[PDB]
């Protein structure tokens, strides 16, 4: 995982 699943949008 990047932010919530394998998604890197800015948390």
């Known amino acids: 995982v ?3 699943y ?3 949008h800015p948390c």
Do not use: M, N, R, T
């Open 2 to 4: 990047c932010c919530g």
């Open 6 to 8: 394998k998604l890197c």
